Amino acid sequence: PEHYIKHPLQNRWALWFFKNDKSKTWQANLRLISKFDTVEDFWALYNHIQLSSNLMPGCDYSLFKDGIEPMWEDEKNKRGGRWLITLNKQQRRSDLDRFWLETLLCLIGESFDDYSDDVCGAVVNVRAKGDKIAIWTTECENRDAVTHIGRVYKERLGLPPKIVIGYQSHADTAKNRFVV
Ligand SMILES: Cc1cccc(Cn2c[n+]([C@@H]3O[C@H](COP(=O)(O)OP(=O)(O)OP(=O)(O)OC[C@H]4O[C@@H](n5cnc6c(=O)[nH]c(N)nc65)[C@H](O)[C@@H]4O)[C@@H](O)[C@H]3O)c3nc(N)[nH]c(=O)c32)c1
């Protein structure tokens, strides 16, 4: 079988694109690119789309589980939050692509052990004032789930102990609940 069957992923994922157009509302600028649920289809999609290094400022990439929209209003997002990573212009050249791909691999590979059910998706923001990468979780009050994801994430990215990342509730964003 392995010689001809695609390798299924634990979850089905949806990749979203966002471009900032002042003529439209924020929700109207969200566009769904494609959905995938196999290892082969992910790499086909990833190799066909632009790297975030080469996106114009004001655009976003979002990878979310099928059934969860890239909105904080979503049922699985309103009571949750995100682990935030801030990038300067030097990091856009050095780390932007590596961190986003590692983020994608942490989602589709289910790298967070039992707490991978609390992951909702990931977002990279390409802005002129600085780039951001976030992993969204479903419940901000689950200290065990949120902090374990933060520890696994920070080690996966290779961040040194001198750097600290913060987790912010989406309700507050519209302060850091935890830091790791
Ligand atoms: C809570 C949360 C947590 C994490 C992520 C999100 C994502 N999110 C973001 N928004 C809305 O989008 C506004 C600006 O977004 P941000 O405040 O995050 O600012 P950014 O850094 O993203 O962008 P920018 O600094 O380069 O801004 C540059 C200039 O463009 C204006 N602008 C930005 N976009 C649009 C747009 O789409 N059309 C128009 N005409 N102008 C826009 C900005 O105002 C500024 O004048 C924000 O207030 C909200 O209304 C959301 N809305 C709902 N309902 N749900 C969400 O989940 C959500 C939300």
Author numbering: 31 to 204, 212 to 217
Q: How do the authors describe this structure?
A:
In addition, the cap fulfills numerous other biological functions that are mediated by specific cap-binding proteins and include maturation, transport, and eIF4E-mediated translation initiation. Upon binding the cap, the eIF4E protein changed its conformation from open to closed, bringing the Trp102 and Trp56 closer to the cap, and together with the structural water molecules, stapling the ligand with the protein structure. Overall, the comparison of these three crystal structures indicated that different benzyl substituents can be accommodated in the cap binding pocket due to (i) the conformational flexibility of Trp102, which was also previously observed for m7GMP analogs, and (ii) the presence of structural water molecules in the N7-methyl-binding cavity, which could be replaced upon introduction of larger hydrophobic substituents.
Crystal structures were refined using diffraction data to the resolution of 2.2 Å for 1a, 2.67 Å for 1c, and 2.66 Å for 1h. In contrast, in the complex with the 3-methylbenzyl dinucleotide (1c), Trp102 was pushed out from the binding pocket, disrupting the stacking interaction, which was most likely the cause of decreased binding affinity for this compound. In the case of the benzyl modified cap 1a, for which the benzyl ring was directed upwards, most of the structural water molecules were conserved in the cavity, while for 3-MeBn7GpppG and 4-Cl-Bn7GpppG the benzyl rings were directed downwards into the cavity, and the structural water molecules were replaced by 3-methylbenzyl rings or 4-chlorobenzyl substituents. Specifically, backbone carbonyl oxygen atoms of lysine 54 and 52 formed hydrogen bonds with N1 and N2 of guanine, respectively, and amide group (NH2) of Asn59 was a donor in a hydrogen bond with O6 of guanosine. Consequently, this weakened the interaction of the phosphate chain with the positively charged side chains of Arg157 and Lys162, mitigating the potential stabilization introduced by additional hydrophobic interactions of the benzyl group.
